[PDB]
Design a protein around this ligand. Structure first.
Ligand SMILES: CCCCCCCCCCCCCCCCCC(=O)OC[C@H](COP(=O)([O-])OCC[N+](C)(C)C)OC(=O)CCCCCCCCCCCCCCCCC
Ligand SMILES: CCCCCCCCCCCCCCCCCC(=O)OC[C@H](COP(=O)([O-])OCC[N+](C)(C)C)OC(=O)CCCCCCCCCCCCCCCCC
Ligand SMILES: Nc1ncnc2c1ncn2[C@@H]1O[C@H](COP(=O)(O)OP(=O)(O)OP(=O)(O)O)[C@@H](O)[C@H]1O
Ligand SMILES: [Mg+2]
Lengths: 75, 160, 256, 119, 58, 75, 75, 75, 75
């Protein structure tokens, strides 16, 4: 119990890995949105919406991990 | 169904006709022609031992018709000129397998319309016409004159 | 001969080809004349839809297998596959793999029985393209004015003469086949514009094409003849002669 | 494929001992020989727990090559009370142990359903 | 006419109408603006399937 | 016994590794969408329809990992 | 003995690493497909065909490892 | 003994690492093949052949790794 | 003894790391060749030769590692 609990909490730390890759995926995404915006600003709003939209797909994995994290942390 | 020893330069990477000589021999008369010595590919281009084993299977399950003919048309008198041990082994193995051979005969012309092959017996000078359905020939060589005009070759056309 | 035949009088050479969109079968068979209300039976009996599916779909399907039963009586279907099924059926209670290896040879037999009993269908569009390219036929026949008077096409039974087709004297091929897979038939044609009639006789056999293991054309016309008859002129056209075709190409000898 | 895989899996169940029973008897006594050697060279504290397997290289191998070495140490680390006692010893509270205190882990193993003798 | 549609299970509105004006009025702001194809039956299925050298029939 | 359990949970933490890469792969995919959109917005629908399709395959593997995760945790 | 089993279950977890790279590798292939499409949208057919074919080889390696995983887990 | 045996099966798991990079490497290769095609789709057969060739070389490493695996697993 | 023997087997597995990067490096090189080829396909022979040469140099490092592996495995 206490022995397995120790590795349980350790696994919960692993959930902070997507938190890292999600940040990098964000920095890269908005970079493409900016450079792409400059080449064709006529559709700014279109690009902008798709930008945040894409980001929503990033925090997806984030919440999924934390959910899976606390789950195995107690299941 | 006319095949040779090398691939022409017009074929692209999608043409694999070379590999269909043994496969696509469902029936008919087959002729493996050897030109007059000197020629290139004496032993490295003799594929009449693999075809026999592959065609022995086709006769077992019917892929190859039972009324077919395969004969080796050798313009020369011997297969390996400078090695009697090898040539004696070949002629010994060809008979053991059941293959037929015709010496002193060289391919002369090929008709692509009616599949007619014109052979000629250099010994008797008698030419004949034979229907073919799977023809393989080792590309014949030819002596270059610029080596004979300079007085370098000897006889056949090879360097002295 | 057409194996799949119901009591329907029309379109006998298309009965197995036509895929109707009916939920069930029509009350009566296709009328050949205008009938009276009392000639047919209103509100057909109970369980009529099931009866029709049996006599219009099941029964003519079994008549096809019975008509061409001589093509499935090979030692492979008769002894090998049933024997293979019994060998593993004795161990069916030990594991599931025995139930499978015992039923597979039965599913394999049904597939060979299924394909071998079907009516032999040649590529008729290739045929009409061949005759309409001949000038001696287009003189009296055209697709806009031609009509069919009779049609016959059936497999040939047993092995053929072992001099014209020595291929079939192969004990390995005979183990899988009792028939030749060749077919023979004719076409009774008529032209309503010129008033001409001809009997288009043909013999077919499977041939290999361009490949090593697969068949190229299961029904290749190696003999195609037309005996044309007009007002007072009789012609005999030879589109494909067997003496010249059998020297170039040989049959395929289906296995399995 | 399923037919062959489901069959060989049966023959290996019904039969199979014809060719592997020797390797099983070999690993059986071998699993007992290394266990017997572990008890000879291993630090057992006042309770039967190998708390110092890293004392030397030979102890590390004897601990890994054993079967019960993982259990005697795991069942001890899982008993919250025995770890509470150890936490007290580290702080400076220690004393002598009776025969009943020495078996505190054996009582814990028995409660789980383990078959332990020598209580 | 309404009975014939029901008895033939042509219960897709406007399938047998050459100009399904009612369908255009209902799709003026629809996503993937489309009207039912002419004489479309809810039971017909023309789906095909092929196998190639590549996967997924490509 | 108790050890393999501590490892079973430890492996279950590793399942959050694709959850990390899936986020990064998204930011990259959506970045290309913006640049591709700014390049030729007239063909948005085609460029777009292919985007979600790719993403569907992306998180599919993510769910697949969680499958193996709970398997080894209980099998 | 018991440890060798503990490592076997661990190696089974390592199989989720290609699962991570497959997600990133997929986002990249579909990222370029978008841009490659916007550059020349007339050739949707050929490009799209090459996408799935490439995807096949990608996922092929994924399940290859999973097969290798269960193998070492029971062999 | 068992320790060396534990490392043997452990290395056997490590072979799945190139499998991950092989998946990523494949997406990059085909992503370029797509872009390389949209640029000049006149050379489909050429670019296509060069693609599969490179991929074949990748499987050489993949198979080489697995070969090394079973070898070290029993030698 | 047995420990150093275990590490010898462990290092032997480490040789699979260049194998992974060698696979990824192969896809990258051929991707550059494909795109560089479509842009100027007239001189395919030049680019093609340079490609295989690089691939050979890549395997050079690959074979070096394996050689290094067996070396420390027995020395
Ligand atoms: C020891 C006992 C023997 C084993 C018992 C086996 C029972 C077999 C009968 C029940 C199974 C029915 C399954 C049918 C599923 C497919 C539908 C179908 O039938 O398609 C037909 C199809 C009909 O064609 P179709 O449906 O493929 O396409 C028709 C195309 N159009 C619409 C255009 C016309 O024909 C066949 O499949 C071939 C005939 C198969 C015959 C089926 C088995 C008949 C068994 C006869 C002997 C039974 C003796 C027992 C009687 C004793 C006296 C009481
Ligand atoms: C409470 C009563 C019960 C209600 C039951 C459900 C009611 C359903 C109401 C009808 C709407 C159904 C939605 C279908 C999608 C219509 C939009 C569309 O076609 O996309 C075009 C869209 C929109 O194109 P557009 O041009 O028309 O609109 C663009 C929108 N703006 C203007 C804002 C940009 O474009 C696409 O091509 C996307 C293609 C993907 C569409 C995804 C479809 C997924 C669903 C299909 C599977 C469903 C089968 C379920 C079977 C279950 C079997 C058990
Ligand atoms: N080009 C095709 N593409 C897709 N499916 C096809 C194609 N040709 C045939 N099929 C399917 O295979 C079936 C059989 O084809 P087949 O040519 O033998 O029909 P057929 O009526 O005998 O033609 P014909 O009258 O010329 O003899 C067809 O009913 C069809 O479902
Ligand atoms: Mg037909």
């Amino acid at each position: 119990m206490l022995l397995v609990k120790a590795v349980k909490v350790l696994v919960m730390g692993g959930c902070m890995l997507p938190i890292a890759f999600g940040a990098l995926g964000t920095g890269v995404l908005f970079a493409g949105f900016n450079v792409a915006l400059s080449r064709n600003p006529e559709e700014t709003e279109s690009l902008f919406n798709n930008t945040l939209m894409g980001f929503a797909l990033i925090e997806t994995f984030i919440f999924m991990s934390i959910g899976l994290g606390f789950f195995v942390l107690f299941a | 169904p006319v095949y040779a020893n090398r691939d022409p330069e017009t074929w692209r990477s999608a043409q694999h006709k070379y590999s269909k000589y043994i496969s696509n021999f469902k029936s008919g008369d087959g002729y493996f022609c050897i030109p007059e010595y000197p020629y290139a590919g004496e032993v490295e281009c003799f594929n009449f031992f693999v075809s026999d084993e592959v065609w022995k299977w086709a006769q077992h399950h019917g892929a190859l018709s039972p009324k077919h003919t395969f004969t080796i048309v050798n313009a020369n008198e011997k297969f390996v000129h400078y090695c009697d041990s090898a040539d004696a082994f070949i002629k010994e193995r060809l008979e053991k397998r059941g293959i037929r051979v015709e010496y002193n005969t060289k391919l002369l012309e090929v008709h692509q319309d009616g599949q007619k092959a014109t052979f000629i017996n250099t010994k008797t000078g008698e030419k004949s016409v034979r229907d073919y359905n799977n023809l393989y020939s080792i590309v014949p060589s030819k002596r270059q004159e610029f080596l004979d005009k300079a007085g370098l070759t000897n006889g056949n056309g090879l360097l002295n | 001969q057409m194996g799949f035949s119901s009591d329907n009088p029309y379109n006998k050479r298309w009965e197995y080809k036509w895929k109707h969109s009916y939920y069930t079968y029509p009350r009566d068979y296709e009328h050949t004349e205008v009938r009276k209300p009392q000639d047919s039976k209103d509100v057909p009996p109970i369980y009529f839809a099931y009866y029709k599916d049996f006599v219009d779909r099941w029964l003519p399907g079994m008549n096809m297998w019975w008509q061409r039963r001589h093509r499935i009586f090979d030692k492979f279907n008769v002894y090998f596959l049933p024997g293979m099924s019994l060998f593993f059926y004795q161990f069916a209670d030990l594991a599931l793999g025995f139930k499978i290896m015992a039923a597979f040879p039965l599913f394999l037999a049904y597939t060979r029985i299924r394909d071998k009993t079907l009516d032999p269908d040649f590529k008729e569009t290739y045929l009409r393209d061949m005759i309409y390219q001949n000038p001696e036929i287009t003189k009296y026949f055209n697709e806009e004015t031609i009509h069919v008077l009779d049609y016959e096409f059936e497999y040939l039974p047993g092995y053929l003469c072992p001099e014209k087709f020595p291929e079939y004297q192969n004990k390995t091929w005979q183990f899988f086949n009792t028939d030749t897979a060749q077919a023979e038939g004719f076409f009774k044609f008529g032209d309503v514009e010129s008033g001409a009639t001809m009997t288009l006789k043909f013999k077919t056999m499977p041939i290999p094409g361009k490949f090593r293991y697969q068949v190229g054309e299961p029904f290749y016309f190696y003999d195609l003849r037309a005996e044309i008859k007009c007002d007072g002129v009789y012609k005999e056209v030879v589109l494909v002669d067997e003496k010249e075709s059998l020297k170039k190409i040989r049959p395929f000898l289906f296995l399995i | 494929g399923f037919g062959c895989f489901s069959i060989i899996n049966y023959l290996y169940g019904r039969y199979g001992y014809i060719i592997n029973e020797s390797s099983q008897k070999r690993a059986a006594q071998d699993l007992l020989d290394n266990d017997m050697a572990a008890d000879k060279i291993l630090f057992k504290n006042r309770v039967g727990a190998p708390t110092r397997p890293l004392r030397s290289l030979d102890d590390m191998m004897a601990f890994l090559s054993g079967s019960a070495t993982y259990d005697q140490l795991a069942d001890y680390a899982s008993y919250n009370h025995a770890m509470d006692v150890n936490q007290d010893q580290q702080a400076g509270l220690d004393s002598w142990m009776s025969e009943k205190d020495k078996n505190m882990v054996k009582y814990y193993q028995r409660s789980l359903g383990k078959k332990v003798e020598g209580i | 006419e309404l009975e014939e549609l029901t008895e033939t299970h042509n219960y897709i509105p406007g399938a047998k109408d050459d100009v399904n004006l009612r369908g255009y009025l209902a799709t003026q702001f629809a996503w993937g603006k489309k009207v039912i194809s002419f004489y479309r039956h809810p039971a017909d299925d023309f789906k095909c399937a092929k196998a190639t050298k590549n996967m997924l029939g490509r």
